[PDB]
Design a protein around this ligand. Structure first.
Ligand SMILES: [Cl-]
Ligand SMILES: [Cl-]
Length: 162
């Protein structure tokens, strides 16, 4: 199991513009287009993103290209982020994937705000960190996905995904 396979499981794949769990305009593999209510604002960002006239529809390849960029951006952001880098460096391979998973989902800014949880992960206090992460709007809104990531952190294995 790898990061791409993990996120493909959590985000799904859709070739037509759609609304995410939060109501925002998304396409492909969790690729957020805009927070704006307008489908037109979305369709424009989409053509900007692909470099063609899409009229809200893309190919598998295009969805994958976008997915490649996003995971990459997610990894570079963690590495560049002063609060995230140290946690990431302190972690094993599996748990590293889990942190990338949250960053792709909520952005660098959101994860960086989970101060207490980050501190417990860095300290390797698994169980405590798992209970703390569950106390968030994130877990309340997408419980099944949150549980999967959280177990990944608690255990250090791909069990939740297999
Ligand atoms: Cl809460
Ligand atoms: Cl969910």
């Amino acid at each position: 199991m790898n990061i791409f396979e993990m996120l493909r499981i959590d985000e799904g794949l859709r070739l037509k513009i759609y609304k995410d769990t939060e109501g925002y305009y998304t396409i492909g593999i969790g690729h957020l287009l805009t927070k704006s209510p307008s489908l037109n604002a979305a369709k424009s960002e989409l053509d900007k993103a692909i470099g063609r006239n899409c009229n809200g529809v893309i190919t598998k390849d295009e969805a994958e290209k976008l997915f490649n960029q996003d995971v990459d951006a997610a990894v570079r952001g963690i590495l560049r982020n002063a609060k995230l880098k140290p946690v990431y460096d302190s972690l094993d391979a599996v748990r590293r994937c889990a942190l990338i998973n949250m960053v792709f989902q909520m952005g660098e800014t959101g994860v960086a705000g989970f101060t207490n949880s980050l501190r417990m992960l860095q300290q390797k206090r698994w169980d405590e960190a798992a209970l703390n992460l569950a106390k968030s709007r994130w877990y309340n809104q997408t419980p099944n996905r949150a549980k999967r990531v959280i177990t990944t952190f608690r255990t250090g294995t791909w069990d939740a995904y297999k």
